Amino acid sequence: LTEIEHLVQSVCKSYRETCQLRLEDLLRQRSNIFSREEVTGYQRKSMWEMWERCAHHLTEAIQYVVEFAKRLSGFMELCQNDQIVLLKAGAMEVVLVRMCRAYNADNRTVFFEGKYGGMELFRALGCSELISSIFDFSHSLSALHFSEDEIALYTALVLINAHRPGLQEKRKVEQLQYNLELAFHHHLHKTHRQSILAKLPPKGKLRSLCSQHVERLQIFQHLHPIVVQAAFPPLYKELFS
Numbered sequence: 001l002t003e004i005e006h007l008v009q010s011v012c013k014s015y016r017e018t019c020q021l022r023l024e025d026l027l028r029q030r031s032n033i034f035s036r037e038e039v040t041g042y043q044r045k046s047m048w049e050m051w052e053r054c055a056h057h058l059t060e061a062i063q064y065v066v067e068f069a070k071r072l073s074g075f076m077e078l079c080q081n082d083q084i085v086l087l088k089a090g091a092m093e094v095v096l097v098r099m100c101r102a103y104n105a106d107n108r109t110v111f112f113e114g115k116y117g118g119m120e121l122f123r124a125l126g127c128s129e130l131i132s133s134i135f136d137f138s139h140s141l142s143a144l145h146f147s148e149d150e151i152a153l154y155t156a157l158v159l160i161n162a163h164r165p166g167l168q169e170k171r172k173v174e175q176l177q178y179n180l181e182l183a184f185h186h187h188l189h190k191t192h193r194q195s196i197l198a199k200l201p202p203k204g205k206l207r208s209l210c211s212q213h214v215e216r217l218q219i220f221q222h223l224h225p226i227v228v229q230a231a232f233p234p235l236y237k238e239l240f241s
């Protein structure tokens with residue numbers, strides 16, 4: 001039996017250990033929705049308190065993605081420069097993809113601080129167009145009904161992309177990429193799920209949305225710096241200043 005069957009198992013294990021929120025929990029909690037009063041309470045919070053809360057949650061989400069990457073076979077054998085290039089370009093893209101598990105398309109709500117709420121929860125941030133675009137992206141992804149292994153293999157490939165500008169050992173990233181592509185396509189064939197391939201997001205769209213999102217987080221961080229629970233100095237240094 002294949003190195004490729006083992007790679008599937010190892011990527012899904014890494015995802016299971018780092019997925020942050022369990023899918024059964026997220027699905028069971030869908031009926032737990034913020035009340036009108038609770039939504040108004042969030043809308044009345046300071047922009048800067050909502051930013052502190054959201055920035056903290058997003059930092060934590062990024063760190064789970066870093067831990068996911070560190071567990072992908074061969075990722076720790078890449079040189080540090082390339083590790084950082086890959087994580088800088090792709091970790092927030094993965095966070096945006098992971099969001100769809102916590103998104104309920106029936107009422108367009110996301111799981112946030114223990115209950116589901118719509119995008120109006122975030123009104124104090126004054127980012128309605130960007131936040132609407134983030135909700136719209138999860139709405140599009142939710143139509144695929146991604147399984148846990150599909151999310152694991154797809155987000156591994158979001159990260160392990162040999163086309164990212166600035167890699168120093170491109171051939172070594174290509175080797176991991178090809179094996180992950182084969183793992184993903186083998187798994188979709190085995191589960192009769194190859195039809196999702198044509199429905200995956202155009203790559204330019206995830207990159208565009210992520211670039212706009214990170215640009216806004218950078219603006220907030222310039223205006224109102226946050227305390228970061230920093231665990232990854234080389235990555236922190238690339239993003240914070």
Ligand SMILES: O=C(O)c1ccc(/N=C/c2c(-c3c(Cl)cccc3C(F)(F)F)noc2-c2cc[nH]c2)cc1
Pocket residue numbers: 055056058059060062063087088089090091092214217218221226228229230231232233235236239240
């Ligand atoms: O533990 C560590 O060391 C560490 C290091 C870095 C981290 N995240 C950096 C962020 C942020 C971001 C966030 Cl999440 C919140 C507030 C402000 C920002 C800002 F934009 F300012 F950077 N946004 O995208 C990334 C990113 C993109 C690719 N890779 C990381 C998180 C933990």
Ligand SMILES: CC(C)=CCC[C@@H](C)[C@H]1CC[C@H]2[C@@H]3CC=C4C[C@@H](O)CC[C@]4(C)[C@H]3CC[C@]12C
Pocket residue numbers: 019020021051054057058061095096098099100102110111112122125127130131134213216217220
């Ligand atoms: C534009 C701006 C200033 C903020 C974005 C507002 C909002 C869209 C952000 C704030 C917190 C985020 C969640 C945080 C954690 C997770 C868990 C992860 O496993 C999956 C992703 C998820 C649920 C994040 C989704 C995006 C949220 C709600």
